[PDB]
Write a protein that binds this ligand. Structure first.
Ligand SMILES: NC(=O)c1ccc[n+]([C@@H]2O[C@H](COP(=O)([O-])OP(=O)(O)OC[C@H]3O[C@@H](n4cnc5c(N)ncnc54)[C@H](O)[C@@H]3O)[C@@H](O)[C@H]2O)c1
Length: 392
């Protein structure tokens, strides 16, 4: 408890001790920063007054890893799991069976990306503890997760960077009030976020000889696509060409590119990023609904898209990195995709003379289940993070 915290403190560098002191004074804004820091430009990240703070605190946590799986407790907002409603008010004592089952239906068969610093407890909160929400998380952290106990009373810091699944929910009572206790698990996934260099090494390791697994026709067609053939190919797909104006030559190229993507399937759970334009979600740059600075437009977007399916007729390019790019400066929707191990796809940026950087291509006709949508501020512009899973 407190004694652990005083022991673990000795393991910290002076800079890490310094980061922890700031955290105690500024926990809220640092945690918030730790959740969205990787979505900005590299130069915005390096300039941020809380960036050195992030790195140091990240490092401190990694110096105390657990030797076995451990359960942790913390309260969470239901909106985190795409339940955009109160389970019950603070004044109310009961959670109805209907509201319980509505929450169950919402979280069922979904994976939820969790990120950023979080204060946890090893003990179930009781009669005299802070209970901010009606939703209590009981999450199993795997062996080797960093965990930093520290004195302020005593708290424990973790850094979330994984998907969670909710295995079971139960209605419990603490101090004459109903809560939903959620038993959750960690599903791991490779997520490079802003570390594009490490993502490149992984990509090149896994796709260096991808060309040599391709037949000559497959190789020629993939080459054609990357040399600029994608415009005609994808417009044909977007425009419903196979149905309304068939082109067998194009159909043949499409088939070969699809077979090439299935040739060396994504070897692990992978998170990728796409800065989406308005037309991917049935909008335009001048659509009033595209103004996410107005809250009713975020609600309307979530109402249409959250919990729903999105599919692309075209081949879909994504990145192993989450950072913003000037080419995408005016895009407001960041698509954050989990790609299950064994899915079609290829790191195209592993091909010697290819101009594209950090790029993973996904198969045409791909479908994504949107688990959860978040908003964030990018300067004055509100932007959206769409937490999606490729369903192959
Ligand atoms: N967008 C990303 O985050 C991303 C990531 C990695 C690589 N790239 C590559 O960067 C280059 C330029 O980026 P880009 O995104 O403008 O190229 P793109 O070909 O992906 O997009 C072209 C335009 O049409 C779009 N579009 C794509 N699918 C659509 C659909 N199903 N319905 C309607 N419109 C659709 C986009 O919104 C955009 O306005 C491309 O070569 C792309 O492959 C992009």
């Amino acid at each position: 408890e407190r004694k652990e915290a005083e022991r673990i403190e000795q393991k910290l560098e002076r800079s890490e001790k310094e980061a922890l002191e700031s955290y105690k004074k500024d926990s809220v804004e640092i945690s918030k920063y730790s959740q969205t820091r990787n979505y900005f430009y590299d130069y915005q990240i390096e300039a941020n007054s809380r960036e050195k703070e992030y790195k140091e605190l990240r490092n401190a946590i990694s110096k105390n890893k657990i030797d076995k799986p451990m359960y942790v407790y913390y309260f969470e907002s239901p909106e985190k799991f795409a339940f955009n409603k109160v389970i019950r008010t603070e004044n109310q004592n009961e959670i109805s069976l209907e509201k319980f089952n509505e929450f169950k239906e919402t979280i069922q068969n979904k994976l939820f990306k969790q990120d950023g610093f979080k204060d946890i407890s090893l003990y179930e909160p009781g009669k005299g503890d802070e209970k901010p929400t009606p939703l209590l998380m009981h999450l199993k952290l795997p062996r080797n997760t960093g965990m930093l106990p520290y004195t302020n009373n005593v708290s424990t810091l973790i850094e979330q960077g994984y998907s969670i699944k909710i295995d079971k929910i139960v209605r419990i009572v603490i101090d004459g009030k109903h809560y939903i206790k959620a038993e959750a698990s960690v599903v791991s996934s490779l997520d490079f976020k802003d570390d594009v260099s490490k993502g490149d090494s992984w990509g090149k390791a896994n796709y260096n000889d991808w060309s040599n697994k391709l037949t000559p026709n497959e190789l020629a067609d993939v080459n054609d696509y990357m040399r600029g053939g994608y415009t005609a190919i994808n417009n044909y797909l977007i425009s419903n060409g196979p149905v309304n104006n068939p082109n067998p030559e194009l159909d043949s190229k499409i088939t070969n590119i699809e077979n090439a993507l299935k040739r060396e399937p994504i070897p692990t759970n992978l998170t990728v990023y796409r800065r989406s334009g308005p037309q991917e979600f049935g909008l335009t740059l001048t659509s009033p609904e595209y103004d996410f600075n107005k809250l009713e437009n975020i609600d309307a977007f979530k109402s249409k898209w959250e919990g729903q399916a999105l599919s692309y007729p075209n081949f879909i390019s994504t990145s192993i990195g989450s950072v913003n790019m000037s080419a995408f400066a005016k895009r407001k929707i960041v698509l954050r995709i989990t790609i299950p191990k064994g899915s079609p796809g290829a790191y195209l940026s592993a091909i010697p003379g290819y101009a594209g950087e950090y790029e993973v291509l996904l198969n045409h006709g791909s479908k994504f289940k949107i688990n959860k949508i978040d908003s964030y501020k990018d300067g004055t512009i509100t932007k959206l993070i769409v937490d999606a899973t490729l369903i192959p």
